Design a protein around this ligand. Structure first.
Ligand code: NAG
Ligand code: NAG
Ligand code: NAG
Ligand code: NAG
Ligand code: NAG
Ligand code: NAG
Ligand code: NAG
Lengths: 130, 113, 101, 50, 50
């Protein structure tokens, strides 16, 4: 099946930084948007971040200036660089796939009208405790 | 932003009776030019916690049986199930797909009645 | 009057015809609020829009930031882009030739 | 921008071959007249076939 | 996969073409192409011109 596995995590002190990553599986990390989602142990699902086909990113107001996400594509992995963590940020973090496009030089990275925007290809999740 | 409000916060269901879980988006989710309304239902289990259940209106995700087919409009939308199976008991989530914040509503916890 | 009307339209079309067609501008614009000091009645009338525009080489694109007036762009509901040019659903937009009065 | 493409969306009803209906007796008489006029140029005893 | 109003996006289009308007072509994801794209430019007739 098409399913990624999260790797990275551990117990850190406030102020520490972490490099969390998701590996590519079955070409789900090629022509596709990617999302990071938080599962709070006792609350509902919270979206953390998203990265587009072209390297654009988006974060909510509580995250901007603290977390950074990126894609290298050559090494087929998605990275999340966490900084300035707080006890409130203890949670399970995991990746999801967004919509899909393609890569032709008419105009790099293209989306479909009426294409997929759901979160799919869910992993297992890493536990981050501050 | 878009606020997604889940109407039930707890819903015990007898396995032998139907159930209805509904939520409402604070903004219209209709893409007028495309014509597609972006709404998603998710089902959380004690085992594999994240999982896509329903995509948009009446379009089941791969692996999802016919009993999970939903309905609704561009604000208030609902899942109606004829019978709740033992494997179907979990926490349901609503998501909007038109803006990057991807706000989620409160979960509905299914109990054995 | 009818002849003057047709003559002015014809001369206008002849002046604009041999000019840049601005085909690369019908893209998706990442528009944000202008960060300068904006008076009370100009709030929301000018947007800072970033797009990926083409260049001489066909395979190379440059990120370009420009200020568009709110009347020149229309909102849309794409996830990653917010606005598009108002005329891209209707016609090609010809740039007036520079150094022409 | 302003380039609208038109294409066949679907077909309602059965898919059938397009066709022309030409009356048999009228066409047969027309060919008889053409044959007489061709015989005026090629000979009264020349067999004309199409 | 057709182009659309915005260079950024594309669209998946389904249409019914006659066999005489298409030619077999070999690719990984496609089977046919338009008959005239191999030799010449194709201009759509204006629908407003009778
Ligand atoms: C725009 O062009 C730059 C050139 O370096 C490229 O890195 C970037 O991914 C492009 N952005 C989009 C959204 O296509
Ligand atoms: C538009 O945004 C860019 C982002 O880097 C910024 O550098 C530029 O100054 C902005 N323009 C205005 C008028 O604020
Ligand atoms: C941009 O300006 C408009 C003007 O009404 C305002 O409503 C909006 O909140 C502003 N955006 C930001 C990010 O400050
Ligand atoms: C272009 O989009 C605007 C959006 O408001 C709409 O009003 C206008 O009619 C559209 N034009 C065409 C030719 O579709
Ligand atoms: C063609 O249509 C006309 C319409 O009245 C009809 O009278 C005529 O017989 C038709 N001819 C053939 C050959 O079908
Ligand atoms: C064919 O016969 C007709 C009468 O039978 C006669 O008038 C005509 O001239 C003849 N034509 C030739 C080419 O012999
Ligand atoms: C395309 O055009 C060339 C022009 O000479 C011709 O040789 C070739 O056979 C054509 N392709 C097909 C598939 O007929």
């Amino acid at each position: 099946v098409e399913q990624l596995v999260e790797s990275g995590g551990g117990l850190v002190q406030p102020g520490a930084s972490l490099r969390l990553s998701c590996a590519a599986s079955e070409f789900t990390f090629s022509d596709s948007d990617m999302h990071w989602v938080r599962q709070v142990p006792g609350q509902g699902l919270e979206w953390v971040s998203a990265i587009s086909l072209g390297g654009d990113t988006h974060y909510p107001d509580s995250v901007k200036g603290r977390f950074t996400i990126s894609r290298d594509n050559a090494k087929n992995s998605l990275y999340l660089q966490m900084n300035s963590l707080r006890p409130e940020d203890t949670a399970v973090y995991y990746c999801a796939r967004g919509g899909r496009g393609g890569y032709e030089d008419d105009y790099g990275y293209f989306y479909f009208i009426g294409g997929r925007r759901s979160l799919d290809v869910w992993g297992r999740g890493a536990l981050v405790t501050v | 932003d878009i606020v997604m409000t889940q109407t039930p916060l707890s819903l015990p269901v007898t396995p032998g009776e139907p159930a209805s879980i509904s939520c409402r988006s604070s903004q219209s989710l209709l893409d007028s030019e495309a014509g597609n309304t972006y709404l998603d239902w998710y089902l959380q289990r004690p085992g594999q916690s994240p999982q896509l259940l329903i995509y948009e209106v009446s379009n089941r995700a791969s692996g999802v049986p016919d009993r999970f087919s939903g309905s609704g409009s561009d604000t208030d939308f609902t899942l109606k199930v004829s019978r709740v199976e033992a494997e179907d008991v979990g926490v349901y989530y609503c998501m909007q797909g038109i803006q990057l914040p991807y706000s989620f509503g409160q979960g509905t916890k299914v109990e054995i009645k | 009057v009818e002849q003057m009307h047709e003559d002015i339209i014809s001369l206008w079309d002849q002046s604009l015809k041999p000019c840049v067609k601005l085909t690369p501008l019908c893209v998706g614009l990442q528009c944000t609020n202008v960060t300068n000091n904006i008076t009370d009645d100009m709030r929301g009338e000018l947007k800072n829009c970033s797009f990926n525009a083409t260049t001489e080489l066909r395979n190379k694109r440059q990120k370009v930031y420009s200020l568009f007036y709110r009347l020149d762009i229309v909102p849309m509901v794409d996830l990653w882009t917010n606005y598009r040019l108002i005329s891209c659903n209707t016609s090609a937009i010809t740039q007036a030739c520079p150094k022409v009065s | 921008p302003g380039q609208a493409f038109y294409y066949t969306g679907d077909i309602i009803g059965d898919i059938r071959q397009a066709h022309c209906n030409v009356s048999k007796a009228t066409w047969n008489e027309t060919l008889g007249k053409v044959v007489k006029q061709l015989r005026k140029h090629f000979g009264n005893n020349t067999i004309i076939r199409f």
